[PDB]
Amino acid sequence: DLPSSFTGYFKKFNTGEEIISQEILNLIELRMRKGNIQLTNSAISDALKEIDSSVLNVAVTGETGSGKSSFINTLRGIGNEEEGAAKTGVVEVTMERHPYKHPNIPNVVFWDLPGIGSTNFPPNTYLEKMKFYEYDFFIIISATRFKKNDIDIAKAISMMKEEFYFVRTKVDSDITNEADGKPQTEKVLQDIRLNCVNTFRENGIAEPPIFLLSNKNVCHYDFPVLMDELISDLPIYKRHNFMVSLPNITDSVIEKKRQFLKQRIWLEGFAADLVNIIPSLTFLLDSDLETLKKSMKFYRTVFGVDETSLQRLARDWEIEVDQVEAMIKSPAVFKPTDETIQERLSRYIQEFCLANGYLLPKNSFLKEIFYLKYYFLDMVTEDAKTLLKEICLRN
Amino acid sequence: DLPSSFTGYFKKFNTGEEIISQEILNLIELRMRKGNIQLTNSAISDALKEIDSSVLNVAVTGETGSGKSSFINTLRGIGNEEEGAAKTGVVEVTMERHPYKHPNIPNVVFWDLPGIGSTNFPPNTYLEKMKFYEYDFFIIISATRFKKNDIDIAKAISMMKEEFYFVRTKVDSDITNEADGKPQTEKVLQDIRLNCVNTFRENGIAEPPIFLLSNKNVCHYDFPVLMDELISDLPIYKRHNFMVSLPNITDSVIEKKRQFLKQRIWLEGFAADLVNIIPSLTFLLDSDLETLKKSMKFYRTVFGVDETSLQRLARDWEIEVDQVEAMIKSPAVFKPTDETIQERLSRYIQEFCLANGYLLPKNSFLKEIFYLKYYFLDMVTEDAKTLLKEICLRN
Ligand SMILES: Nc1nc2c(ncn2[C@@H]2O[C@H](COP(=O)(O)OP(=O)(O)NP(=O)(O)O)[C@@H](O)[C@H]2O)c(=O)[nH]1
Ligand SMILES: Nc1nc2c(ncn2[C@@H]2O[C@H](COP(=O)(O)OP(=O)(O)NP(=O)(O)O)[C@@H](O)[C@H]2O)c(=O)[nH]1
Ligand SMILES: [Mg+2]
Ligand SMILES: [Mg+2]
Ligand SMILES: [Mg+2]
Ligand SMILES: [Mg+2]
């Protein structure tokens, strides 16, 4: 039956890839069996509302000149040259916090916090004037080893039953400087991980795990692990909003993004009344057409394959966007061509259903718009991996 | 007579533009009158030797993340991307000094000094392990206001009868952040100059003058004044080597460079035996031809009009060097063209002497090579100003 099926699509994903908890999924299944379409749709819409309305506030504290402002621009996927991005080299020194919303996901805000050092208030008033209660978790950055200042902040955070994370930036510079001129014969990474703990263990018991990374190289070292760790500690419903905002550094992250978005499509489709009508018949409406345009540009912006991000492969090899656009099939979706869109989308739907079935029990179907979303999602995901390969060979 | 004339060319320059002191010029004039060509030439060659052999060691101390490493690359005229330049963002943290010679003037070495803060030794051993006696003068950098650490270093420097200079970097970021969003109605510069003194005056009496500048904008604010101030405090004979290494930020600096080089040409010409032979006759030798090539590429590298620096106008407007080379007459000197070089240099000499005479009393002349140097020097200087205009309109 339908209740059985909706429950199961959630099962093909991993336990850490759940867009919604098992507590609510069983609540939706229960309502569905009741037969009251009103309450069922409402519960699903509420779940979607909870996810979409979910706000994440990340507080970042750290000594000057470590890479925390560049760390803000890194996760946001923004260069250190833009005006909307955090000032990457220069430091504010306002004793005043400044928020930074994600360019694509406004519900994601990063806070650059003044180091306790150079604050003009006793740490008792430091934390209060900060308003740290509002944040979901803390990120602690240090360019070298973590000093007492940073450590004392950590202890307070741990004491308040909140999560914190130590981030050691500029690891690339250490390896380069230490290795420079020496023979070919990952020792630097091991020395730094101990050095951070050596200062920790001196005053602070039970040194926590520390992540060594480089804001200039998001794809290597412990950068991937940190993102994975942050999501797991976050509440189930909060993972969705944060996940899509993360940098597309690997195929795993890209695929993970696809998986979450796939579940949201499933949810959205179910929130809408199901039908007995097979898609790919007659023509689509302008309203549903515009909704696909908004959904498409949303998927493209998340996987960094949007026209704005298409500006940044043009600089990698000095190659115009058109040339970059040819590799991927994303931009060539809403392009005015002789081959109408009403006849083009009619083609996408047929290929998808023949290869993947209708995803639902016989005689039951999702609205046409939802099947197109799965197709686009798959298309953009594949494009992200294709674009990724070209990116990795350079720089 | 000849003694009278050699003395006078030095007089047409400013008192602060003297490549050599009045104490030695009078020594050269005395020897000349004696008639002993041996001692006279030797004295001049010694003067040239003293200047050329002159070594300058600049120690730079400062708290982390102010712009002192970028300050090293700024004066050297090197980007923050090169390997030979000081690591511009990242910080060494080796508790160990590192030298940086000028790319064109090896006798100019900049030292990035670890802040007293984070040194593991008492300041009594700090100064000693530093070996600060070797430096001619100190540059003190601070990204905001100067702390007790910096101030105590300053007091010790002042106490040792040595010159020091306070440099406040990143002033551009302060003005931008403070002005951001506000109406059109130089207040920021006045507030910072007092803030530096406010911390100074608290413990340190007689606040010294402080220079506000930006490593991202060498041409504006107090950057020009600092260079002028540094040279004046330096010993006469040491000015030459440092001057030519300085960034070509203004016409005044470029003209000043020309003036010093003009005096050196004069000296070099006099060190060589003078003749009764007029130049621009017959043909030049390959040895003198090669000497002109070395002297030309030397002048071009100083005024930043060399082929290496010609790479950096190509990025300003995305314009190939050839296009940049057309504006200036520097690169088109040693280009294989139908119009031989033996006939080309024969043209430069005639135009120069007709417009500027022989610079010496009747029947007396400098060697041909020296007149060509004056011509090239003038040509390169004019090219520097021409190139400067194109640079200033952009960025
Ligand atoms: N090699 C390397 N350099 C880095 C890294 N992160 C930052 N930097 C360097 O440090 C500068 C960035 O300073 P910034 O990020 O503002 O420091 P911060 O950690 O944000 N703290 P603050 O906000 O006090 O400055 C840049 O000039 C850049 O060269 C990194 O991961 N690797
Ligand atoms: N706006 C602005 N930013 C600057 C200036 N100087 C440096 N910066 C910024 O700060 C970083 C440079 O750090 P750096 O120069 O190494 O600091 P420093 O003063 O050399 N001291 P240290 O050697 O300890 O780092 C760059 O990322 C750059 O954005 C300046 O004059 N203006
Ligand atoms: Mg910041
Ligand atoms: Mg929490
Ligand atoms: Mg340095
Ligand atoms: Mg001195």
Author numbering:
A (entry chain A), B (entry chain A): 15 to 199, 203 to 356, 358 to 413
Sentences from the paper on this structure:
Biochemical studies indicated that Irga6 hydrolyses GTP in a cooperative manner and forms GTP-dependent oligomers in vitro and in vivo.
A combination of four of these mutations (R31E, K32E, K176E, and K246E) essentially eliminated GTP-dependent assembly and allowed crystallization of Irga6 in the presence of GMPPNP. Crystals diffracted to 3.2 Å resolution and displayed one exceptionally long unit cell axis of 1289 Å. In contact site III, G103 of switch I interacts via its main chain nitrogen with the exocyclic 2’-OH and 3’-OH groups of the opposing ribose in trans, whereas the two opposing exocyclic 3’-OH group of the ribose form hydrogen bonds with each other. Via the ribose contact, switch I is pulled towards the opposing nucleotide. In turn, E106 of switch I reorients towards the nucleotide and now participates in the coordination of the Mg2+ ion. E106 was previously shown to be essential for catalysis, and the observed interactions in contact site III explain how dimerization via the ribose is directly coupled to the activation of GTP hydrolysis.
